[PDB]
Design a protein around this ligand. Structure first.
Ligand SMILES: NC(=O)c1ccc[n+]([C@@H]2O[C@H](COP(=O)([O-])OP(=O)(O)OC[C@H]3O[C@@H](n4cnc5c(N)ncnc54)[C@H](OP(=O)(O)O)[C@@H]3O)[C@@H](O)[C@H]2O)c1
Ligand code: NA
Ligand code: NA
Ligand code: NA
Ligand code: NA
Lengths: 499, 499, 499, 499
């Protein structure tokens, strides 16, 4: 409908979304059902490409795509992205509706993602801040005298953008934007569970003038994508997902430029001098936002003895005063989780914590195949490390609360999980803050706020199991671009007179 | 002897070099013979560590190494490196002798490598040019108003430095320098065929004060190293080697920060307006230097019709007027190749070129198990692409000569090999040069000079099969360092008044 | 009319433009006539402010202006500039008409300036590339251990933008843009000879939402402006004008941040390997464009013996085939000069050159009080240096042609004038080009093109008598901004453990 | 003696130091007596150059100096500076003795300055961090398509370094270092009151190989220097001194690149959450160090009601427990002031403060023509602004103490003086600190430490009356260097295919 006018095929009741094969929308591979977490019903179908079509798509992106993307001057790429922003913006409601239906995202959360995608597109201009090379004079070494060097960046060619389910619209728009702004062609591979927003975005981009042979959207399920990652024409792979899949991706890909945003949870530390209202409010939000289905969600709260009581109490009040329902009621605070499987795991993890000495302070009640109350489990420092909610990432609205003696204990506990994406610290003392910033092994630390990557105005990425490299405005250039050095030799040519 | 005073064990005639286990020199694993390519004789032995020692070494580097390297202020790390430079410099002759004997490197070439290693150490100060973070103000987006960001770099922890045989001293010193200057611990794994210089370098570094638990040298053969690369305590892997091993390394390593210098040959392009004396001289040198056992060696020469004759003729004269012998005679220009196996391949490749229409213009005669004449094979443009000397990298003193109609043919031929390390272009016209610089898919282009990475004053690395990422003074920081973002929230705190 | 709706006062026949006093349009000082160079007729009048109003305007800009400009977040400043671009763009024809009438600018040249002003405003986003501070860690010196540093930029406060007559619209828009984008208030002082475009631009900016107390436009004549420059509330002075006035400005201003674009002519060098069609075409244009009333105009042509003949001949053909008339006929190539005084000087300078051995190769005929033929005077190298057309800048469509033996003579002659704004060099050889780039003492060198600052996509400014500092997208930040260093002390606070 | 072996002329009892005239030590102008503030005795004499010698020196620096400095590759300039560091270091005691005798500097303070000068010289390598140009691609604007830009820095030529009396050794070494490291020649003009250290430093530099025609040391008194500043061959003027002289310097110099470090005092703010021991200790030191003859000396202390009592009390104890004597006793804490005139002013200023409601809390007693007790005067907020000790900079060991209600009052008082060099803030709360950092109009803010420029590891400079631009490692490049832009035109040359 609308954007996907002549694209969506209305086959026997359910709308069928085809893959975009770098030139034409189509696909002759298996058809796959797409369901809503709101009622487990099949809301549409997607056509996956055949091995022959995947192969043909890659051949196109590699042979023509790289050149039409690279040979379109930046000023036009910028215009394409801005026009794509205009198109998505006027279709805001439709984009939002699909997010609410397909991802079970609360209405306002879905509207936020569309706006984030629109802004990312419009701010492509800011990505230019990291454009420009280095001039290296050669008279600072005898061996390089009368020599000179120029270093600049060049697009790698074809970038594979693999995307998660929790931000089906933004991640696709993001990776496409930074890959394309520098001159690359892109193969987008969305989560097969909610590939509709990506299809809509790509259509808006194509309508905006995005070189038709420089982009692709393949509805491939899981391991079917390995075919793309393992191919030599794919010079870079931008992957946002789970640690386990990310690992499999590199082992399949081999030598190549990578950006691995592998998430995991995020710990939050509250110091005795923190504004507890701000902290309680922000931590509660960081715990339940989009049913905790955020990589930058808060999964552990560590508070110093003196404020632990109030803090945990306040966060508990907030979490239980939440309304869990269908994402449509602008009254509902929390919608469903992407699958009943996800809820099972959350329940199991809560039982595990309880068995190991944990006590539920809020939530805990499952309300349906895909509905649960955001839960807050208190745990003694001496037992938390063996709890599943600690050792692992339970993608759900659930966090642990742990009392700590001082900053050092907070820090060692915060660093005790295998991940290191972000960390939040609420407090006022510059010294304690500086110490925490140095010792927290994470890609980013949020001072007096909950972790929120937003559109990447500030760069983010992981450490430890959370991955490698960063995404951000300007910073993502390092992942879809390679350096090119030009060394000029003027030895004895009389440019310099011994210097 | 000297540096390796109480380290080398004189066991029944041949000196035995032990591995350095992050604290003590030792090893209780198999012993391996080290031979000279000059006479196939066993000149020494190296003790490899046992699985238990490898494991224990990693535990040390990870638990104590990262902290003693990171907690040694930069000013002291700098002093350590400078003192290490002094030590190697006064032991220049001994270092050189081992290179000549162990790697078959011509005396002056071995002396050059020692001096390169000394300079790299002394210029660690220049690596600081890429130290410093970014301050990102937040009033350039409504969502980030009254917000602020700081981005800086942090050492990853433990870096594994895997090294090739052709620059056994420099590569080890290089990777150790840039890994350590930023606060990392290092596990060095030298080629098991010539691990002596690395052992000497590490000793000089340890003598200079390099934190004893922050460095390691393991004499592990090939696949025995996979154990190190696959370990989670190894946050980065700096690998310089063949495309094939590099690929295996990443597939074993998984998600991690990588620098892959995978070589391959380098094409050289001569334009009709080039200074043929300079070009002939530089190309000849780029072909035979260290028996072509240089990743940045010239493997293909492409000259435009009008100068092709003179050029090829002059380069042929130069190559055949070369003296091939024992690397010791300062009179010998070319020493042996690292193994008879290497010579076999060169011979096979020359026969292949000849069978496919190629003609030998210089050299071609094998002089012994590990000795050969640097060879120059002319080939018609219409047949060169299927020749082994073209499709592959024959690590030996051998290059192809191909006449071309114009710049575009030179460029497509130059880009026709699977590699893309460097490329040389000799000419004068800025337009033709600019075109070639844009279209040559290589990490670096050398204008009017032969490709020579030197000590990395200018950054270098590959494209296509030549690998990913770069090494260089200042630039290598990006491979052994990770970003850390600190976002400060002052919303409503009165720092700004709506701005 | 239109923009200046309720602003322009229709007093007895001629439209009267008032000054903008940081809040209200007005002025109670002397009225001054504004004439057209097309017919010496009074086309309007401007109201200059009284000493009391100047004083009051400064008090406003300083006390309220700095804060309303600084406290308007960048994202809004950007919106203001973009909206101002929209307003000027829809009023393109009116803006152009005033330029043609008030400055005698050829229709297409006037249209170009309006478009340049619109683009400058729209690209303010690119100025952000030089936004961001430096983080300086302190462990690289013993004295600074456990210490840390942050360096960033801060707006100076009130910037005085003084403008020339030859780009009455662009210079005003330019200085206002870069001054405002970083948070400064601005006092614009246009040339009293053509202050109408500035008034229109300021109105478009005010309509766009530019903080009303953060900007000012004072119609002050020459020395009347000294009052502004000498004031302590004016933290920076951005001056584009003649060397002589610039000098007086600093001597009146004292200690303050300055940008002095003082022009002078530009020499052009043609090498024997240059494309003479390109060179002839570009040099001819650089000589006559806007009647040579461009600071980056070509005033001297130096060609090597072998191409000198053709080149000079071709440029002569082009200059004489030019149509001189009223700037309105899109058929006229060259309009009038800003004043009859300017033509007198050009005539005197041509006679001087002739008396000193020069020969006219094209032009030379005066056609009216303010009309002349763009002139090309050939001069022997041994006599050119004493000619007025060489030693001085004759702001008119006139250049000298000098034959030279080689590059070195071209370079010494090019460096022989007292100025050093830009220089053009046409040729192909990288070596000769590199030499010329190193030895030409000018702010910018244009390779194979005529000097053209455009909107400052590339930064420009002078050397020698041409001034100091630079203007450009991103670069101008250095002139209206100051550094602020924050040094944090954590000595003995346990952030670091000796490091 | 020693360094000044054949330089110092022993004329009738007192050693006579000649000026260095860019090639030979000499001078045929008036002789001037140099006295010690320790006993008002004439300890030596300096020979000033004659107008003819000044003129000849400038001609040399301009015609040969710029080229021998610029044509000495950086690697050698670096060696010169390092060798100069070695020479000064072995002559440490002699250098220190002259400082103690000639400047009345306490033994340990004099030793610190020599060590600072040695380090500055040795760290010249760090100044390279800001070396390197920018490559600007042209496809981000239609007008600049197929165009390209390179921006780099170039030395200005001859830099005039004018120096104060309070750091006669360091300032001279500093300005010489950053001016020379980039390729400039230098004219040093030391304070005629203590020009001996400069002479010694220049000798050490000349001995180290500093191009003999690229440096000069002229013993000119005050206005005699104007001759240098006003000259066109002097492209930049690096001046550290009083606001009043700085102003005169620019008005005499005209258009030129400037760095004006004009000092003034520094306010210190203590927040209720500050570590009062640290603050008391650091503020006391910032007040008395070198008899307050430091531009970064603390002249005003502002403490919040709750800690004001303890703080002021503790600082008073510290100041009065100080030993005032001859700088030689390593037991003496405070030596004399440079002149009896300076003490008179301090006394007058203290009486003024007292008359206006101020009360002395420590010191106040003059002990001789050039000796005084470091004084601490308490003043009510409602009267301090009219006190001389507030409105002006009394170069002496004297500061005001003012109780304030909150941060905003502290900030407005701190910003109330006409200067804005540095500011210190002691406290712990990030919010209050961030606010103070934003609103303090000074070049640098020191958090939890006294203001101390040191060797400029962190850049510093003024705002308001404290001057313009910055000095620092890396940052000073902006003052003795100019940009050079090279724009290459490839329009229609086939480098790009519409991009
Ligand atoms: N791109 C550049 O900048 C650059 C620079 C220099 C050389 N090169 C290239 O690299 C090659 C260097 O010579 P080389 O013959 O020694 O090549 P190589 O065999 O690929 O060198 C491999 C290094 O990796 C180790 N290794 C082998 N198998 C491994 C495994 N499975 N897991 C982990 N590590 C393993 C090797 O140890 P063992 O000795 O025990 O096998 C050796 O230290 C040449 O092809 C050259 O073109 C590239
Ligand atoms: Na692969
Ligand atoms: Na792994
Ligand atoms: Na002034
Ligand atoms: Na002047």
């Amino acid at each position: 409908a609308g954007l996907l006018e002549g694209v969506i095929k209305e086959k026997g009741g359910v709308p069928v979304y085809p893959s975009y094969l770098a030139g034409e929308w189509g696909g002759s591979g298996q058809e796959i059902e797409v369901k809503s977490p709101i009622d487990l019903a099949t809301i549409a179908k997607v056509i996956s490409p055949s091995r022959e079509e995947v192969e043909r798509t890659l051949d196109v992106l590699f042979k023509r795509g790289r050149w039409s993307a690279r040979d379109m001057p930046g000023t036009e790429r910028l215009a394409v992205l801005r026009k794509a922003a205009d198109i998505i913006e006027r279709n805001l409601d439709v984009f939002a509706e699909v997010l609410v239906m397909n991802a079970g995202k609360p209405k306002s959360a879905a509207v936020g993602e569309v706006k984030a995608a629109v802004d990312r597109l419009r701010l492509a201009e800011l990505d230019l801040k990291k454009i420009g090379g280095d001039y290296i004079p050669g008279d600072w070494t005898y061996d390089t005298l009368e020599t000179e060097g120029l270093v600049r960046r060049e697009p790698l060619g074809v970038v594979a953008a693999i995307t998660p389910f929790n931000y089906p619209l933004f991640d696709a728009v993001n990776k496409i934007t930074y890959s394309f702004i520098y001159g690359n062609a892109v193969v987008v591979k969305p989560s097969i569970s909610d590939p509709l927003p990506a299809a809509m975005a790509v259509k808006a981009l194509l309508d905006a003038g995005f070189p038709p042979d420089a982009i692709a959207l393949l509805n491939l399920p899981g391991k079917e994508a390995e075919k793309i990652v393992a191919d030599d024409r794919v010079a870079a792979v931008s992957f946002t997902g789970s640690t386990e899949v990310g690992e499999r991706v590199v082992k399949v890909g081999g030598v190549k430029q990578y950006v691995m945003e592998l998430g995991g949870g995020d710990p939050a530390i509250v110091l005795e001098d923190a504004d507890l209202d701000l902290a309680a409010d922000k931590i509660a939000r960081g715990i339940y936002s989009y049913a905790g289905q955020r990589c930058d969600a808060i999964k552990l709260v560590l508070a110093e003895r003196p404020v632990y009581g109030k803090l945990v109490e306040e966060v508990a009040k907030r979490l239980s005063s939440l309304r869990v329902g269908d994402p449509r009621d602008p009254t509902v605070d929390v919608g469903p989780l992407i699958s009943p499987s996800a809820v099972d795991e959350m329940m199991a993890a809560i039982e595990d914590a309880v068995e190991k000495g944990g006590r539920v302070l809020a939530g805990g009640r499952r309300l349906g195949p895909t509905y649960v109350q955001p839960t807050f489990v208190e745990a003694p420092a001496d037992r938390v490390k063996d709890m599943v909610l600690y050792k692992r990432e339970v993608f759900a609205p659930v966090a642990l609360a742990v009392e700590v003696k001082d900053l050092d204990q907070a820090i060692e506990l915060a660093n005790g999980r295998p991940y290191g994406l972000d960390a939040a610290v609420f407090g006022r003392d510059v010294v304690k803050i500086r110490r925490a910033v140095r010792l927290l092994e994470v890609g980013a630390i949020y001072i007096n706020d909950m972790p929120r990557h937003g559109i990447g105005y500030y760069p983010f990425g992981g450490r430890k199991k959370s991955g490698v490299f960063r995404e951000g405005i300007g910073y993502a250039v390092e992942a879809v671009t390679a350096y090119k050095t030009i060394v000029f030799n003027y030895k004895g040519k009389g440019v310099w007179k011994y210097e």
